[PDB]
Design a protein around this ligand. Structure first.
Ligand SMILES: [Cl-]
Ligand SMILES: [Cl-]
Ligand SMILES: [Cl-]
Lengths: 310, 309
């Protein structure tokens, strides 16, 4: 059987699988009263992509397609954004997926830039294509956020310079974090319709364990705070497992966090086949590890393995 | 154990010179240009060169703090002190051209500057204030001196910028005609030569051209379809860096394969320095499947005669 392996990249060499930014830190805390069911950054350790997970970091929380019309009443200009697969073909809602791959998996106000390049050249400019880019916000809580049905709504404040043309949304952060709920899924089909094709929720089963997350802070357009988003594995682990597809000889890999300079093991954890990590820790306190550290696969165990306290 | 290349498709990889997906393969004659990019430079045995770092989202990004302002008619320019990507002060005596990820082209880099203030606000439960706005970083300005620790960012008529910690996230370009992807900026400004460079690359074998991975870039406005060509995808940089596989010879023979049909489509040389050549003359459509990827075949040398692509 092909040996299972984990990337040796450091935290400072990897990206969050739920938002296209570097990982800032490891994080663990109790999650008994939250449902942990993210849809980006979901890959089994034997290489099966789940949820809305795709391979390209820059496509996480990005949309592409075209603007078809203005809806903008009071407050701001609003635009109807027909979205397509990341490769440009029409999204098929009968696929067993929640929404087009990379769609955001949280409730909040996604801030970024919409860029357009027109589909036909301009005859008075030697047939070159016209372009425009402006800031925009995509509310993932709007009743018009229906990515599974092929469209979302984007607002551009007082900017009216948006055409009915091919468009891409590149995420930057959040408009505000007033109601940012990273563990609450949006309605991918809007009001009164349940989500489908979901990666399952994850939780520790063994007494005394918590999930270990990879955390990144997010920029804000305005207001106050230091919002953050937690992923189950880095995006580079998704791409590694997807390519390697090593057989999972049991459903739990024992992994150790190591300092390659000193050669010493710092702590150990369980990497569950479903694609998430648990550790033996109670509470939320500083995780004192070196910047050069990374996880190494040690051996195949099971869900009843008793980890050393982290 | 042996030498491997990622099996990711073009549609699963990112440009190593700008944080966007790869759109297509490209080859054309380059005898009259100097191909010396500084991002996306990694030897096949894992040595990072130039300004190359590992994270796609840090390519063409800067972080640091704003420290000053200059008016320009009704427009605003800001002094942006930059640090290493990990936040520590950049040491210009290091044998690198500039902080890792600094742009490697002359152009008007368009993106968004985001700030989060250093100290909290008591009236907001000691939370930090934030703001983000569009900006342009000219890589041709005399004030573009990243090797010396700073660049200048313009925000048009927006004056809502503080002397606070800041990050610039790139989106694309402000114009097409002044974007020269093969002309390096002056990392130390006027009258000072660049240092720590990854070397220029070129085909030595008669009849060969460099094969590039091309992406189109967004524009803030105006006309055009600008593009940027990298030598290998960013995911190849990360693969070679981790694997650090010994280069048995200085040239790997690689074949582009369709995994569904199992058939080889064309072959190429992957040079140890970190670039690909093909036997082709001219620039014409490269007709390959979207599912295709390169596979290492064998170790050869610079005199291997490739089949015509
Ligand atoms: Cl054009
Ligand atoms: Cl379990
Ligand atoms: Cl804060």
């Amino acid at each position: 059987s092909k040996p299972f392996t984990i990337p040796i990249l450091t935290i400072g060499e990897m990206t969050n699988s739920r938002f296209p930014v570097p990982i800032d830190m490891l994080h663990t805390s109790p999650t008994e009263n939250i449902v942990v069911q993210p849809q980006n950054g979901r890959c089994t350790i034997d290489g099966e992509l789940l949820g809305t997970t795709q391979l390209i970091t820059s496509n996480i929380c990005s949309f592409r397609g075209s603007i078809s019309g203005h809806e903008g009443n009071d407050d701001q200009h609003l635009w109807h954004f027909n979205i397509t697969n990341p490769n440009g073909t029409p999204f098929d809602p009968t696929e067993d997926v929640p929404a087009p791959l990379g769609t955001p998996d949280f409730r909040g106000q996604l801030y970024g830039v919409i860029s357009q390049r027109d589909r036909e050249g301009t005859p008075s400019e030697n047939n070159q294509k016209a372009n425009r880019s402006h800031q925009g916000v995509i509310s993932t809580i709007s009743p018009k956020f229906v990515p599974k049905l092929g469209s979302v709504m984007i607002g551009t404040w007082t900017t009216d310079d948006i055409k009915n043309q091919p468009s891409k949304f590149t995420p930057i952060g959040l408009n505000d974090d007033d109601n940012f709920k990273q563990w609450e899924l949006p309605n991918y089909s809007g009001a009164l319709t349940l989500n489908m094709g979901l990666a399952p929720s994850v939780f520790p089963t063994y007494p005394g364990e918590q999930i270990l997350f990879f955390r990144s802070y997010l920029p804000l357009k305005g207001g106050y705070g230091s919002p953050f988003i937690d992923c189950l594995v880095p995006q580079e682990w998704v791409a590694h497992f997807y390519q390697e597809s090593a057989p999972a000889q049991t459903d739990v890999a024992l992994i150790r966090y190591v300092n390659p300079e000193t050669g010493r093991v710092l702590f150990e954890a369980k990497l569950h086949r479903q694609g998430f990590i648990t550790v033996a820790k109670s509470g939320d306190s500083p995780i004192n590890v070196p910047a050069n550290g990374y996880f190494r696969f040690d051996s195949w165990v099971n869900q009843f393995y008793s980890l050393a306290p982290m």
